Amino acid sequence: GKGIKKHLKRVNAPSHWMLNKMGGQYAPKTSSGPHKLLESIPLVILLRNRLKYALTFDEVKMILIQKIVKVDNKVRTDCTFPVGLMDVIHITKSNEYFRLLYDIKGRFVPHRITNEESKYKLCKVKKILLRKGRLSIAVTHDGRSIPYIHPDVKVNDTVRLDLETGKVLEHLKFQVGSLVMVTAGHSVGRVGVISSIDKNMGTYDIIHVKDSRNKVFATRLSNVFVIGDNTKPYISLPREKGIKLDIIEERRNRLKA
């Protein structure tokens, strides 16, 4: 037959998964869920190859059996569960909270997060639908459906979704001064203020983003994520703060120690 493929070859795995060639012939195919396979990482990899808590898949299963790891404050027990771009995974045993982010290089890194920030996740809206009764519902990057959004929320906006109540608290627009983070581009993981946008009739829309050091980089509209206004980010960025350094000064300031 020709049904859905259910295996993932090790070399065919996404690059940011960052697995070794000789470490077996297969990679864990993420179960279908809230995030795309390419745009996410299974929690098996998250806490075997990143947190190093478990050194085999079986120990990953042993961890997951105890309802101790919660993705967005709800217990998850699927080994190949897609965690996705930004969300709060809380481990109760060590009482630690990680918000998943990108880095300037473009891999998925857990970021240590305090309790007050761990109940406060960001969701980039992707679609605005209206169902029966003229009730509007937002489809977010998280694969989440939020009914009864404010009318002022637009298609590309980003809402602060509270983890417990699942309700939006406030939304951020996509003006030319809005802080943004690139999610899949050549400049994945970069953070900037959106210098400008341009609308292409019937084709991809490009936006040019200004860095902290006045560095302009362009990207497609489909893979940007508003993370705040001009004032400041609404989350805590990793140690590079989303500032991608050039290949020269990166070596230069790595050398000095």
């Binding site: 000789m22 290949i247 070596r251």
Partner: protein, 185 residues
């Protein structure tokens, strides 16, 4: 199926197999560096051609080209770390002038012979094979070991070697001597 373990050649055959002058200079080099076979200097030329091609390509680029100020500095620092370049070097042109003896100077047997230890280059080779020498905290028995500028300071006899403070001498001769002494006494 097929393993994903990469592997590659290290030497290129010379072509024109019976060039008199090339054969004579190869014999000069292998005899005076005490190496074992014509494959070794061919690996050395293969390596040297690699750095030479890198340097030529870099020098084709214009100055202030980020490719240049990255690859050229990486190559320069690598060369000065392996010891093929002195502090008086600053440019890639000086890299281009690297020669076969300047690359053969960094072999482990060459270095131990220069530092002493062995009074012959072949003696150095055989000692390295008999694992009597250490590059500091680690013992290597590969004569083609290339030392860096931070290693020659701590090349010395291996601690487990008889010349490094281990078991003194021929246990057979010592046992025979002690047995004869005990029988006579």
């Amino acid at each position: 199926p097929k393993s994903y373990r990469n592997y590659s050649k290290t030497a290129r055959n010379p072509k024109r197999p019976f060039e008199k002058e090339r054969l004579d200079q190869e014999l000069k080099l292998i005899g005076e560096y005490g190496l074992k076979n014509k494959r070794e200097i061919w690996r050395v030329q293969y390596l040297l051609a690699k750095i030479r091609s890198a340097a030529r390509y870099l020098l084709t680029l214009d100055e202030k080209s980020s490719k240049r100020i990255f690859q050229g500095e990486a190559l320069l620092r690598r060369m000065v770390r392996q010891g093929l370049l002195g502090e008086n070097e600053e440019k890639l042109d000086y890299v281009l002038g690297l020669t076969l003896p300047k690359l053969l100077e960094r072999r482990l047997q060459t270095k131990v012979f220069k530092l002493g230890l062995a009074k012959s280059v072949h003696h150095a080779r055989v000692l390295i094979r008999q694992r009597h020498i250490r590059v500091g905290k680690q013992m290597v028995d590969i004569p083609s070991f290339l030392v860096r500028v931070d290693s020659e300071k701590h090349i010395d006899f291996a601690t487990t070697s008889p010349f490094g403070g281990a078991r003194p001498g021929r246990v057979k001769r010592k046992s025979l001597k002690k047995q004869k002494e005990k029988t006579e006494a």
